[PDB]
Amino acid sequence: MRVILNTGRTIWQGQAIESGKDLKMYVDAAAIIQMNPEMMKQLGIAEGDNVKVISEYGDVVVKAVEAKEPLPEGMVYIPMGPWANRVIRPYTDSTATPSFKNIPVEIIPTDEEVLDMPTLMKVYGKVGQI
Amino acid sequence: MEYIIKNGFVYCPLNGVDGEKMDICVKDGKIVESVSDSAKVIDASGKIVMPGGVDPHSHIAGAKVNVGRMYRPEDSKRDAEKFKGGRAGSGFSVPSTFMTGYRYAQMGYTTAMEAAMPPLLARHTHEEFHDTPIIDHAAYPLFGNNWFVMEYLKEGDVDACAAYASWLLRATKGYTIKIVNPAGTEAWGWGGNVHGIYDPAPYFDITPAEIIKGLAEVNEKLQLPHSIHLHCNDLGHPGNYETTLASFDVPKNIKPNPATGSRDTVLYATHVQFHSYGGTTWRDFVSEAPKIADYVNKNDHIVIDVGQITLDETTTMTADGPMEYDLHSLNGLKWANCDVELETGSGVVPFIYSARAPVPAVQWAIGMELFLLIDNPEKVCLTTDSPNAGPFTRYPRVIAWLMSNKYRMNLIEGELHKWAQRKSTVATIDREYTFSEIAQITRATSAKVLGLSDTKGHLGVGADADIAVYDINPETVDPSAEYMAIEEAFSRAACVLKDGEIVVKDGEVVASPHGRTYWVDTQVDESIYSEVLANVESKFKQYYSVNFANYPVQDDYLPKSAPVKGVML
Amino acid sequence: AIGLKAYPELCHGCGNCVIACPVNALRSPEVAGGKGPTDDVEIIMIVEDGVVNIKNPDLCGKCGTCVESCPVDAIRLEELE
Amino acid sequence: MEYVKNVVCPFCGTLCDDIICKVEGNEIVGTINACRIGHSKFVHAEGAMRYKKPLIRKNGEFVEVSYDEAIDKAAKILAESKRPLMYGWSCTECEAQAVGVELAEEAGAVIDNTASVCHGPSVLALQDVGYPICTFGEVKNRADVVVYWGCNPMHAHPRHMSRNVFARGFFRERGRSDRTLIVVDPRKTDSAKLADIHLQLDFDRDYELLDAMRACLLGHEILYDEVAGVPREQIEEAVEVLKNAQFGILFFGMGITHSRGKHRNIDTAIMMVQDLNDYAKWTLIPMRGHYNVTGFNQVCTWESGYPYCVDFSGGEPRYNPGETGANDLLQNREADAMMVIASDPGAHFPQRALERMAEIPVIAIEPHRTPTTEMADIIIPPAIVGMEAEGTAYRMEGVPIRMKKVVDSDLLSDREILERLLEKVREYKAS
Amino acid sequence: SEIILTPKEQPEVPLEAPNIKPDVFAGKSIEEIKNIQIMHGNEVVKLGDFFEVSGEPADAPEDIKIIIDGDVYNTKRIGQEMTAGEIIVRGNVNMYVGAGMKGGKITVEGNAGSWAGQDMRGGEIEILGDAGDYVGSSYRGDWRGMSGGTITVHGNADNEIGEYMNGGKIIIKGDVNIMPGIHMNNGLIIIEGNVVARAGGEMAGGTIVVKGMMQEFLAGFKYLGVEKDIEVDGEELPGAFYKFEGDHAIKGAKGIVYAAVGCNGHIAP
Ligand SMILES: Nc1nc2c(c(=O)[nH]1)N[C@H]1C(S)=C(S)[C@@H](COP(=O)(O)OP(=O)(O)OC[C@H]3O[C@@H](n4cnc5c(=O)[nH]c(N)nc54)[C@H](O)[C@@H]3O)O[C@H]1N2
Ligand SMILES: Nc1nc2c(c(=O)[nH]1)N[C@H]1C(S)=C(S)[C@@H](COP(=O)(O)OP(=O)(O)OC[C@H]3O[C@@H](n4cnc5c(=O)[nH]c(N)nc54)[C@H](O)[C@@H]3O)O[C@H]1N2
Ligand code: SF4
Ligand code: SF4
Ligand code: SF4
Ligand SMILES: [Ca+2]
Ligand SMILES: [K+]
Ligand SMILES: [K+]
Ligand SMILES: [K+]
Ligand SMILES: [K+]
Ligand SMILES: [Mg+2]
Ligand code: NA
Ligand code: NA
Ligand code: NA
Ligand SMILES: [S]
Ligand SMILES: [W+6]
Numbered sequence A: 001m002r003v004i005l006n007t008g009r010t011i012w013q014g015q016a017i018e019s020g021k022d023l024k025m026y027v028d029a030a031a032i033i034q035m036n037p038e039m040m041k042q043l044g045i046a047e048g049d050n051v052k053v054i055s056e057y058g059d060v061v062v063k064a065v066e067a068k069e070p071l072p073e074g075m076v077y078i079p080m081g082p083w084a085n086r087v088i089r090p091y092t093d094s095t096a097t098p099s100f101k102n103i104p105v106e107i108i109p110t111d112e113e114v115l116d117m118p119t120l121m122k123v124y125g126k127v128g129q130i
Numbered sequence B: 001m002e003y004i005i006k007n008g009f010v011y012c013p014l015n016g017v018d019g020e021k022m023d024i025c026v027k028d029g030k031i032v033e034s035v036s037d038s039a040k041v042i043d044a045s046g047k048i049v050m051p052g053g054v055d056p057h058s059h060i061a062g063a064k065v066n067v068g069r070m071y072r073p074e075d076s077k078r079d080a081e082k083f084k085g086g087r088a089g090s091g092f093s094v095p096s097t098f099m100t101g102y103r104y105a106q107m108g109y110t111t112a113m114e115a116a117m118p119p120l121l122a123r124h125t126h127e128e129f130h131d132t133p134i135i136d137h138a139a140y141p142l143f144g145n146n147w148f149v150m151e152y153l154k155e156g157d158v159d160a161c162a163a164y165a166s167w168l169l170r171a172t173k174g175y176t177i178k179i180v181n182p183a184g185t186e187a188w189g190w191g192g193n194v195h196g197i198y199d200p201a202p203y204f205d206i207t208p209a210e211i212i213k214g215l216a217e218v219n220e221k222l223q224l225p226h227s228i229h230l231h232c233n234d235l236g237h238p239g240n241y242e243t244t245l246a247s248f249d250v251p252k253n254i255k256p257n258p259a260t261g262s263r264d265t266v267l268y269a270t271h272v273q274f275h276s277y278g279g280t281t282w283r284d285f286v287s288e289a290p291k292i293a294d295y296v297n298k299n300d301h302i303v304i305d306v307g308q309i310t311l312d313e314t315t316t317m318t319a320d321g322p323m324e325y326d327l328h329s330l331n332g333l334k335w336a337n338c339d340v341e342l343e344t345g346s347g348v349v350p351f352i353y354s355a356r357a358p359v360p361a362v363q364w365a366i367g368m369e370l371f372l373l374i375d376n377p378e379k380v381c382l383t384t385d386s387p388n389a390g391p392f393t394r395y396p397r398v399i400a401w402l403m404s405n406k407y408r409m410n411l412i413e414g415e416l417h418k419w420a421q422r423k424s425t426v427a428t429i430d431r432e433y434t435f436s437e438i439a440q441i442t443r444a445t446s447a448k449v450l451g452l453s454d455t456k457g458h459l460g461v462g463a464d465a466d467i468a469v470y471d472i473n474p475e476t477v478d479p480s481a482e483y484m485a486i487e488e489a490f491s492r493a494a495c496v497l498k499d500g501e502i503v504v505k506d507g508e509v510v511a512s513p514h515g516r517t518y519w520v521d522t523q524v525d526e527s528i529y530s531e532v533l534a535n536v537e538s539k540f541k542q543y544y545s546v547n548f549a550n551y552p553v554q555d556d557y558l559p560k561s562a563p564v565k566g567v568m569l
Numbered sequence C: 001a002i003g004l005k006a007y008p009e010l011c012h013g014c015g016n017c018v019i020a021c022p023v024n025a026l027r028s029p030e031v032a033g034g035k036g037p038t039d040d041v042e043i044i045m046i047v048e049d050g051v052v053n054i055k056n057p058d059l060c061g062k063c064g065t066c067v068e069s070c071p072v073d074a075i076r077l078e079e080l081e
Numbered sequence D: 001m002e003y004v005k006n007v008v009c010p011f012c013g014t015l016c017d018d019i020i021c022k023v024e025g026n027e028i029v030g031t032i033n034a035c036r037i038g039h040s041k042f043v044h045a046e047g048a049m050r051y052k053k054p055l056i057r058k059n060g061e062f063v064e065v066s067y068d069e070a071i072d073k074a075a076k077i078l079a080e081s082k083r084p085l086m087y088g089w090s091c092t093e094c095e096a097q098a099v100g101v102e103l104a105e106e107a108g109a110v111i112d113n114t115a116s117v118c119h120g121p122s123v124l125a126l127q128d129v130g131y132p133i134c135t136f137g138e139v140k141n142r143a144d145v146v147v148y149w150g151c152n153p154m155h156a157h158p159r160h161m162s163r164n165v166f167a168r169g170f171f172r173e174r175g176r177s178d179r180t181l182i183v184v185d186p187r188k189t190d191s192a193k194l195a196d197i198h199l200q201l202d203f204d205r206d207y208e209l210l211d212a213m214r215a216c217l218l219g220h221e222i223l224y225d226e227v228a229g230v231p232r233e234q235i236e237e238a239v240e241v242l243k244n245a246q247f248g249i250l251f252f253g254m255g256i257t258h259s260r261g262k263h264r265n266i267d268t269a270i271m272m273v274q275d276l277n278d279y280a281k282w283t284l285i286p287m288r289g290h291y292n293v294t295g296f297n298q299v300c301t302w303e304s305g306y307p308y309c310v311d312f313s314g315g316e317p318r319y320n321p322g323e324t325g326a327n328d329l330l331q332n333r334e335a336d337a338m339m340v341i342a343s344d345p346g347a348h349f350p351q352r353a354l355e356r357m358a359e360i361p362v363i364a365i366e367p368h369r370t371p372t373t374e375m376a377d378i379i380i381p382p383a384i385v386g387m388e389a390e391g392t393a394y395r396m397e398g399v400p401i402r403m404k405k406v407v408d409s410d411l412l413s414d415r416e417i418l419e420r421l422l423e424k425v426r427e428y429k430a431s
Numbered sequence E: 001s002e003i004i005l006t007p008k009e010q011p012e013v014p015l016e017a018p019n020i021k022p023d024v025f026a027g028k029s030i031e032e033i034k035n036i037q038i039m040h041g042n043e044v045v046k047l048g049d050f051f052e053v054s055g056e057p058a059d060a061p062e063d064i065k066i067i068i069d070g071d072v073y074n075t076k077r078i079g080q081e082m083t084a085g086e087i088i089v090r091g092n093v094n095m096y097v098g099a100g101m102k103g104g105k106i107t108v109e110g111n112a113g114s115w116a117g118q119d120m121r122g123g124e125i126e127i128l129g130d131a132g133d134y135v136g137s138s139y140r141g142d143w144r145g146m147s148g149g150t151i152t153v154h155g156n157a158d159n160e161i162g163e164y165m166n167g168g169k170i171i172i173k174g175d176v177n178i179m180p181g182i183h184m185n186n187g188l189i190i191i192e193g194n195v196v197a198r199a200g201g202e203m204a205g206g207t208i209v210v211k212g213m214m215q216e217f218l219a220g221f222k223y224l225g226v227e228k229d230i231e232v233d234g235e236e237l238p239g240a241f242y243k244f245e246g247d248h249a250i251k252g253a254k255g256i257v258y259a260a261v262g263c264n265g266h267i268a269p
């Protein structure tokens, strides 16, 4: 289904970045998609089920969680981090600042696993430069 | 290290030297009686030798200055430079810090004072001064709208207010009691202002006249080197000359008592051009500079600076928050503001002073009347409230206008709006300043009134070796006819020494030493000091947004601390 | 009986409850003005190790001011037994 | 167990300076007063990597090297680059930031901070229309109307509301009861749950709502019956609440800097705040993110004349956000090398910028393992500002506060690393 | 006289070439033109290092026609501040094409980057492809923008076209994205295609004409009615248009927005 992706802070994502972006708690805080219970019923999913998020700019697998901060109808929330930044709009409109918030995306349930932090970064294929 | 500056025409008003050919000897940062035969020679034949320039009022370091820099990228695009051997910089009216130090040194200035420092933001002023090369400097903390000052002076407790000022000058590493629109900027904390010297701000119930008188008494009880430094209420309004003259009389019966230096005046009034307006509105507006000049001529307790209009596109930045909002309401240009908790306010607005527009033309004439109708240059300093009336790089043009009635008449009869002739007496004044009088208003008056004349503003034995050499021959130049050569020579000094080391050679910067930070060290009765400190800390716990322990400026911020003593036990 | 109960696992350590409490504000001028205490003081609760921590429960009057100040229901008035 | 008081928190722009650190045998083991985030920065989480030595990438694996070897290779990269990008800076102190500006001049680099992904649009706006602000103590002591527009302080500046809203001030002695709290956000955030008025507007329509509010403020009719999902009558009522304030403060965040219009959303909010001063005293404060993002823009401005996106390729400074910002230089493939300091673009830049980071040399001056170190060729670990190193930081409304050294580290400070890098870049440029 | 610049391979680090203009080429031989300085990142290089040069010199810029016979997608500031003569680019250009130009003509056969005609004073710019953001805009912080000249884009353009415009004319034959005429003071903007949102946002004066559909508009505008067969600064535009005055969020605003009736019924109150 087509939804609007909003991204930003959570206190839990804050605690995780300061504890360690190499820990399991960062995957648990930032590789997630918050949604209203009504949207979870439309998709036929439950908390803890994985979701494939696709935009014009990329793709990512994140874990569904029920939103404790209610969303307007048709909006979802992925906390800021490398999972969110696989799919948001990179273009700056000649300002230097990308479009991190309110991007149209396609979401469907998936049996694929969420990628941990080092594995997710391998999608970019870093080539050693020295 | 030894230097001998040979065969120049010396101008040192404090020592009575008026263009005499003589040698100046230098050893390890000081002017001395004589040097050995191995001393390096600086040939000044056919040139003018003066003490290093001393600027008593400029906006060069701190919060309001940096908002002006940040929010004016177009001011930087207009004037961006990379100095050979130095740092990159930019800004025509609000230069970056390295460029500021370079441009003062290039025109032979070696000391400049930051005119308006908010106490809570003092660390910002000192950090900018660290990145300001060459010039010695000081910063003036603001007191005219401070909550502690207003509540102690309301009750007539000048002893407690003196203990608070002693602590604040040390905590901010400041030098002067600066007063800007007393009570008015507090009233601007609620969107208002005060009108005249008998109108109180809300709640505090203390008038501007009571703040001025009380702070002048505090200043002399603390035996500070400089006097109170006042920016009057009602800045820029037709008919404000009456408020100005009334303000000038408020501290007249207070006797000066500096511990350091030779100051003998109780009041310093800044950028008086903006405070000399007649009429009741802009429909019957006239210059009242002749009445202001007549008051200064007849009274012995006052020194002024002019705030001369340079006729440029510049930036206004002051601690007069409501005046800045009113300026934005008139020209519609971008407006910045910063109300600082319990202390002060500020605003920044760009401003175009066009020669062809009627109010800028009269404002230019008002400043010229103040310089030229004040008989004694010992009562005057050359300023532009930089950048408010124009950038400090225009001081050489101000000098050239003062030395040439031909330059003035070429502007008056040319582009300058006819209001300069109809609303002022400037076209009837043929007086031309001499080289001695120029030296008086650019280094002697300022050094003396600031309490620094034992070491600054003169070329006598015992002075710090801060020296400017200008490529002007006073035996052959006609300053009236050759006004563009005067302007050009004062803009690019042939040689500048700072603490006896060459920093400028043929208008180019060749060395970037760090300058000293002058600040005032005072000690009051231990019992009143302890009582005031307990009250200050209690008010921090309840009403400030920071903890008392983190408020004072740490020693790390002053690499060359130069304390000056006031009262001691 | 009804008494003060903390849920530190839900707490942000925002300090709204600490400041809003009239008992804490009366005992500490720093707290009255929005700061965490620096001077040594005995108050009902403080933010410690990032979460609300109840120190002197006997001083609580069960007024409900702290409860209105918490948007995440991390401090409550409920039956303690 | 020792208690170190009056400590400054090195996390967000609230820059709390009343932190108490619990110290046991050269280790910060706990805190008092710091929120959940601040506490997490101060204490070590078991299992998190804290690098003890510099590292260089070889062939997928990393090898430990000395500071001399790592700085030598980093200097060679910067010296040989035609368009080097020096990015981050917001989580270090002002002295290290000033060495950075000097190094960017020496290398002919572009220097830029996190403002280019944050309040950079607010900087573009304030340059065009102005900046009417105040310090936190004026909010605490005078404000009767507090607005949080497109910011969620309960999750992002956790002690901000307790310090500025619940606090009892000089003229607002009843604290929360003396203020009207307004929150503008498309979500029902934990900050909106505390508000007296929650304008739950349509996303990406703040500019449209602000146009209607400004026309109404100036005595004009609103053309449409509903704007950004808010009925005409309720827009008129919101404007009356603002006009009746004795002292109003507009706090704003990423909700309007990142969304449709970017800098023009801030521009219209600033102009509304300015025009409100004909009826009531009004000011604004951008909710600056990192504890020292503000300090970089202050340092960079006072030294060069420009705040961010500063290009020194031509010697004299030049400024063009949209051309000279980090994302512009990476996405347009102009940058040929990148030095990262005290920031994590690996985690926090969009995919299109990461694709460029995969193809160019990356130097990371970073203490912990992050997505940026996963993309790095050289890792140089420093002592952490506010815990193991001192220096100035600037709060969101420009108040400077000195950060403290609470415990000792054998690692070099960022300032020391940058001074050695500057000396080595000069040596390579000469040879 | 024609001077031909044939580009060699364009570098990945862009070139900045403000000296590519008839004013600099005037009075120089072919060998002197090859020595003209340009920037390649943080290094100063010669024009000849990145272009083959041929043709016939001329003493006056009005008699010079520069032909760039190839793609210069990574070359910035071509024609900056030119006063006379002509430039034809047989390919794309990067940012700042004709920035601050006072006279003469520039034709770009391909696409142009952002800031095409920034701060323009006079002359003509014609882009046969698409343009970026800030066509005919001002510089950061300045309240005084484009004061004259004509810019025509045959394709589409992006955001903030005519930002702070204070004279001249901009014609977009395709579509625009958001905020065309933002802070406009004077001048004329004609959009023959569509607008996504915020046309004339914060405008104080000037005229904006939209012949296609405006998806969204602004509540600060006053609706004046339908006007047919309109005429604006000599440009005759046949058909019916909804007329609006604003943006009344600005004090003393006198700007006009015309929107074609056929596809803007949802914009009229
Ligand atoms: N926990 C945590 N705290 C942090 C950080 C962190 O990484 N984690 N980083 C710090 C930094 S660098 C920054 S900049 C601050 C930022 O702090 P905030 O400015 O609070 O930033 P966000 O949480 O990204 O977004 C704020 C709100 O904008 C809303 N929003 C989305 N679209 C729109 C819109 O169209 N209109 C409006 N009005 N609102 C909208 C979102 O729903 C969200 O609640 O946080 C700082 N604090
Ligand atoms: N999708 C999405 N993406 C976003 C955002 C969003 O809302 N949505 N927000 C954006 C914003 S506003 C911002 S600012 C960025 C986040 O900005 P970043 O700078 O990417 O944020 P952090 O992950 O906090 O990175 C700070 C780094 O500094 C390191 N560090 C801490 N102390 C020190 C020190 O003393 N010295 C040095 N050298 N390093 C130190 C930390 O370990 C950490 O890795 O994210 C942006 N990206
Ligand atoms: S209990 Fe609630 S109000 Fe108190 S600190 Fe925790 S989150 Fe904040
Ligand atoms: S219930 Fe009332 S007294 Fe008890 S902690 Fe909460 S606010 Fe304080
Ligand atoms: S609010 Fe920000 S500065 Fe204050 S303790 Fe929490 S993270 Fe640290
Ligand atoms: Ca502009
Ligand atoms: K500037
Ligand atoms: K006297
Ligand atoms: K609750
Ligand atoms: K940690
Ligand atoms: Mg104040
Ligand atoms: Na939903
Ligand atoms: Na004052
Ligand atoms: Na005339
Ligand atoms: S930030
Ligand atoms: W940020």
Ligand SMILES: [Zn+2]
Binding pocket: B180, B231, B270, B271, B318, B319, B385
């Ligand atoms: Zn003043």
Ligand SMILES: [Zn+2]
Binding pocket: B057, B058, B059, B115, B116, B318, B385
């Ligand atoms: Zn001044």
